[PDB]
Design a protein around this nucleic acid. Structure first.
Lengths: 50, 94, 28, 123, 128, 657, 58
RNA sequence: UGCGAAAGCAGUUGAAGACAAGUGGCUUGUCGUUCGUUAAAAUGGCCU
């Protein structure tokens, strides 16, 4: 998705359809960074408990 | 998350027992492997968020700048202007 | 505040058609 | 002969052909070595088309060459990857065009019907 | 107002840190939008912010690097090959000043996990 | 304020796909080129146009048939000493023999069998072959000059839709048919097998698809026939002994046409994947073996090829091709790998299709049997008229008022007047029956009520009478009889100017209606325009030599600046089409071709294609950025309107690096 | 106001239908089909265009 | 290009010649040209 938004930036400007796909992809990235951050916290507390 | 709360609260309520257990990582080697598999890919998903936020924010401010036709447009194409003038000989005969 | 500035400057790090009628002008 | 940049021998050994680089451009010549039955020279701008007269240098770059056994079918292979077969009787050309990369090996068979070649991709 | 005086100072002289101070007195993403709506040759404020960021990457003030990252993600097109005298070593040691964050982010989340662990475990150790 | 411009991309006007073409003469490599060379294009909306390849390809005569008629085949007949004639087909069972006088089908022979699929004229041009759809091949004798067509014989029937035909001599007709097979009928007088076939040679088939040969031509030097079919398999068959000399699976899809040159060193094939390639037999050992090589390839097109042709001379040798994208591509023939090709523009509208007027700031745009009127201000697409009695449209001119619109058709031409009730018009037909029964080529609006009309019979009249002087008949005008035919006329307040395609331009009175010619031209007169200031008419021929003339003959501007013309005007490729004068200085004139615009003064002086033979007898401003150009003019004073043009296929994929 | 227009256009442009037992076709003006001779046989030129836009090629 | 850790550290960037094009000279470009510095663009894609 990084190389497709690198190569299709002006079509993102013109076309309205995949803008909501980019929007909820932003939400999916935020959901996944929240999940991986709390999993990193669990990795930290296991490094405490060892 | 709805059982990441479960996998943390067992640690929080009981920690000292499995600390005093002399072999932690040998029998807990699956869980922290799963969590490091979950957590080792942070930097390029930060890169994903950076480039995606850049592109969609640039598109959003440009669309907010140049979205000035959101009430009534796409005129000068009318079926009523075509109405019976596009016949122009059915009305001449009839 | 450390994780806030940390995520904000990792964001810094990874931040490192034809219309049918127009009106133009020409010269003389 | 004075300047050569590419020369190849007929596979039976009764002919060779070299290049000259004699400006009004770089030139091709074919010389029989035992007898003098065939000997000729021409600028390779005649072999070049006008599609290569103005574009990049890697289609003016002759990369490999070979001769038939008899002495009437020369073959050049250019660095873009076309293979211009030319005659030797009237200097008219023929476009064998499949190599996407540069042409390194090419040679006629023993009669002159089979141009056997091989380039950068391993075919 | 503050953005207008900042733009006048920026088109006037070398008061770019005072222009960052004036945009701090405005304190708005709308003010950042106003300054990036202002059109000129907007060079060398990147040089000021490169020196400031490389001398203080761990400063609590969000607003000046937020303003300049908004400038980077908005005017990210028209600055790439336009300057190459000092900008290559400038951005290179800027990037060298900014690698530290992504190499300390997992261990910072590890200390955050330890601290959340210790905090709520001491809250559970409540004594009736 | 400087000249404010309208980039206007409203009108969805396009010619339809070209399907067939044919040269007039024969090649004859070692002969000086004839002065009567013509090239006939036939598209898929029945508008057979003609071109003249000398002087950088000026289109002159259009013969347009209207709604629901096509042409998928045509050929020329030029016997030595008589009129060049076109025989074309429609979709259905009639060989239409057109005139070359005034665009009218002078004969329409309903052929007795089937539905026609292909014509092939015979050598010495006395016989003609059509191929029907029931299976027959019909021979039609054409002798006795124009107008005459008689059925001679039908040859032996079969059960295949006969697709393409070609003669060898006056004896053997080769016909490729829709089973796969190409058959060889004989049809010769005084011989015992007339009407009988001889061989059914069979092309190689394919299992998943009915293979059908789309074309076949004869090669006289190496006595062969080349066949192209619907698997791409271009096969070179031997004529006597009637079998396959060699084969090529060169092409990748349906081969649709092919040709050669006058001594058959080359065969150019072109199909539906647009890859036109050239097989050669040039070397002396290859013609000792008489064997063909797969010499060169060329891609040139966007979508298709549906027809091809070739021509040679001692001053001209080129190939002309066309397909379902609507253009016309010309390559040098004998230097196909070497030659600098040339794309034609899709519209070179030397018969214009869109007019404007400065009252109400309105633009009229007449498509086929349909007009559309709008006006300026944004804009509003005001009205759209369709006509059903009018089938093949022609010039459609508006008044110097938003009232009277005359729409032309060479059978029945009509007049309306226009009540602007605001956001829509109201169109009111008015019966002009002398107009409705005459035939009109040019309608030009002298005054606001009365108009002038040209005729399809070389007369000139006034609606709401006029005489002209005769013109001598040169032998080229005998050889092609629309050279002596009036092509342009311009009026403004009781003074007219006419100009044929012969090279003669006459003035015309209206208060007395006498001619007074002023000929002054060697080659074809492209565009004329009177000029009230200085009493001067401007002509411009196809050579892009501009002239102006004075009545009751020369200004030294026209004497000097013509041969000391600007440099773009010297090197110009696409010819001029339209002329008009300026708003403010009536002697500064702003005129235009279909790829450029030149605004010229009147006193500021300054210090391939066929070219062997003679003619058809025996402050400065220059801009380019509006290149798909339909029609430019002046809406009103400070503004200037361009009328521009704008928009599956075969997947020939571009390599990504 | 929706389809009455094209219905009356159809019933003025069509040829007549069978009254009683037999039918009656009209006969057009000879001063129409004298400058543009055929009508294109649609049932076979759609066949040639279908073959050229065959699905086997793309 | 040199070091080094998979990250980063320090630093290059010329001289001459030939040829071509464009406007007798003059502007622009290529190098199967020399010295010195450690310094994308031919419809063409892989067998039985």
């Amino acid at each position: 998705v990084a190389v497709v938004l690198e190569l299709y930036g002006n079509t993102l400007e013109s076309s309205p359809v995949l803008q909501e796909l980019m929007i909820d992809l932003k939400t999916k990235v935020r959901h996944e960074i929240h999940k991986s951050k709390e999993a990193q916290r669990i990795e930290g507390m296991l490094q405490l408990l060892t | 998350g709805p059982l990441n709360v479960w996998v943390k609260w067992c640690l929080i309520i009981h920690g000292g027992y499995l600390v005093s257990i002399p072999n932690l990582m040998s029998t807990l080697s699956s869980l922290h492997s799963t969590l490091k598999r979950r957590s080792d890919l942070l930097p390029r998903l930060l890169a994903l968020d950076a480039r995606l936020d850049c592109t969609i924010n640039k598109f959003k401010t440009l669309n907010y700048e140049a979205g000035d036709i959101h009430s009534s447009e796409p005129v000068v194409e009318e079926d009523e202007d075509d109405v019976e003038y596009n016949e122009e000989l059915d009305d001449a005969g009839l | 505040k450390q994780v806030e500035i940390a995520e904000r400057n990792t964001e810094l790090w990874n931040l490192i058609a034809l219309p049918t009628y127009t009106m133009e002008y020409l010269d003389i | 002969w004075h300047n050569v940049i590419l020369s190849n021998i007929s596979s039976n050994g009764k002919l060779l052909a070299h290049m000259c680089k004699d400006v009004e451009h770089k030139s091709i010549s074919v010389v029989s070595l035992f007898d003098d039955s065939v000997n000729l020279s021409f600028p390779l701008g005649s072999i070049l088309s006008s599609q290569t007269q103005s574009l990049s240098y890697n289609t003016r770059y002759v990369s490999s060459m070979a001769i038939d056994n008899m002495g009437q079918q020369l073959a050049v292979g250019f660095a873009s990857g076309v293979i211009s077969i030319v005659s030797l009787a009237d200097l008219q050309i023929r476009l064998l065009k499949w190599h996407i990369d540069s042409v390194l090996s090419l040679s006629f068979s023993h009669d002159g019907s089979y141009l056997l070649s091989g380039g950068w991709e391993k075919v | 107002n503050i953005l207008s005086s900042h733009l006048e100072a920026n088109s006037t002289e070398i008061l770019d840190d005072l222009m960052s101070g004036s945009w701090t007195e405005p304190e708005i993403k709308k003010f950042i939008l106003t300054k990036i709506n202002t059109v000129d040759h907007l060079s060398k404020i990147f040089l000021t912010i490169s020196k400031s960021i490389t001398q203080n990457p761990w400063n609590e003030e969000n607003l000046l690097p937020l303003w300049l990252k908004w400038l980077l993600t908005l005017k990210s097109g028209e600055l790439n090959s336009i300057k190459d005298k000092h900008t290559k070593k400038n951005c290179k040691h800027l990037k060298s000043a900014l690698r530290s964050s992504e190499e300390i982010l997992p261990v910072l989340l590890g200390i955050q996990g330890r601290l959340e662990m210790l905090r709520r475990q001491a809250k559970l150790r409540e004594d009736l | 304020e400087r000249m404010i411009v309208h980039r206007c991309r409203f009108v969805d006007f396009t010619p339809a796909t070209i399907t067939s073409l044919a040269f007039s003469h024969k090649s004859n490599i070692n002969k000086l080129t004839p002065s009567d060379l013509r090239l006939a294009i036939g598209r898929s909306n029945g508008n057979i146009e003609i071109w003249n390849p000398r002087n950088n390809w000026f289109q002159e005569m259009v013969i347009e048939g209207g709604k629901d008629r096509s042409i998928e085949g045509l050929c020329w007949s030029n016997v030595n000493g008589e009129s060049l004639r076109l025989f074309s087909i429609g979709g259905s069972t009639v060989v239409t023999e057109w005139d070359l006088a005034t665009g009218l089908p002078l004969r329409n022979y309903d052929c007795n069998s089937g539905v026609i699929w292909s014509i092939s004229i015979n050598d010495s041009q006395d016989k003609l072959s059509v191929g029907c759809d029931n299976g027959t091949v019909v021979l039609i004798d054409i002798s006795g000059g124009p107008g005459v067509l008689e059925h001679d014989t039908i040859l032996m029937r079969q059960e295949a839709r006969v697709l393409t035909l070609a003669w060898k001599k006056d004896d053997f007709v080769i016909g490729g048919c829709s089973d796969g097979r190409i058959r060889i009928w004989s049809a010769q007088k005084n011989d015992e097998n007339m009407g009988r076939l001889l061989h059914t040679m069979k092309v190689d088939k394919a299992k998943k698809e009915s293979t059908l040969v789309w074309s076949v031509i004869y090669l006289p030097r190496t006595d062969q026939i080349a066949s192209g079919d619907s698997t791409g398999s271009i096969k070179f068959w031997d004529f006597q002994f009637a079998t396959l000399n060699q084969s090529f699976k060169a092409h990748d899809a349906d081969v649709l046409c092919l040709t050669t040159d006058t001594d058959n060193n080359y065969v150019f094939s072109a199909g539906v994947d647009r890859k036109i390639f050239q097989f050669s037999q040039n070397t002396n050992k290859s013609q000792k073996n008489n064997r063909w090589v797969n010499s060169s390839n060329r891609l040139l097109h966007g979508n298709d090829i549906r027809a091809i042709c070739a021509y040679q001379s001692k001053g001209a040798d080129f190939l002309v091709s066309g397909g379902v994208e609507k253009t016309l591509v010309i390559n040098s023939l004998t230097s196909f790998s070497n030659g600098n090709y040339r794309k034609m523009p899709t519209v070179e509208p030397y018969s214009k299709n869109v007019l404007v007027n400065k009252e109400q700031r309105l633009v009229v745009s007449w498509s086929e049997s349909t007009v559309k009127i709008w006006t300026m201000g944004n804009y509003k697409l005001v009205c759209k008229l369709t006509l059903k009695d009018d089938q093949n449209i022609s010039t459609c001119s508006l008044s110097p008022d938003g009232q009277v619109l005359v729409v032309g058709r060479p059978s029945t031409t009509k007049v309306f007047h226009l009540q602007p009730v605001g956001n829509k018009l109201k169109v009111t037909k008015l019966d002009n029956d002398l107009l409705l029964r005459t035939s009109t080529k040019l309608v030009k609006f002298i005054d606001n009520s009365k108009i002038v009309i040209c005729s399809c019979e070389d007369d000139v009249f006034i609606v709401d009478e006029v005489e002209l002087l005769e013109v001598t008949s040169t032998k080229s005008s005998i050889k092609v009889p629309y050279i002596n035919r009036i092509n342009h006329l311009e009026v403004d307040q009781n003074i007219a100017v006419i100009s044929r395609g012969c090279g003669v331009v006459d003035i015309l009175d209206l208060k007395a209606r006498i001619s007074k010619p002023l000929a002054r031209l060697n080659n074809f007169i492209t565009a004329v325009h009177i000029n009230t200031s200085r009493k001067s008419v401007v002509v411009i021929t196809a050579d892009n030599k501009i002239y102006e003339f004075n009545m009751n003959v020369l200004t030294q501007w026209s004497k000097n600046n013509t041969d000391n013309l600007p440099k773009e005007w010297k090197t110009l490729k696409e010819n001029c089409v339209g002329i008009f004068s300026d708003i403010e200085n009536s002697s500064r004139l702003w005129f235009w071709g279909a790829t450029w615009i030149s605004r010229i003064d009147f006193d500021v002086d300054f210090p391939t294609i066929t070219d062997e033979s003679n003619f058809m007898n025996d402050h400065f401003f220059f801009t380019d950025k509006y290149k798909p150009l339909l029609f430019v003019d002046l809406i009103s004073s400070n503004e200037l309107a361009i009328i521009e043009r704008n928009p599956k296929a075969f997947i020939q994929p571009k390599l990504v690096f | 106001i929706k389809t009455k227009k094209r219905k009356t256009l159809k019933n003025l442009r069509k040829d007549s239908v069978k009254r009683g037992k037999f039918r009656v076709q009209l006969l057009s003006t000879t001063q129409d089909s004298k400058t543009l001779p055929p009508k294109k046989e649609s049932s076979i030129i759609r066949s040639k265009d279908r073959w050229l836009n065959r699905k086997a090629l793309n």
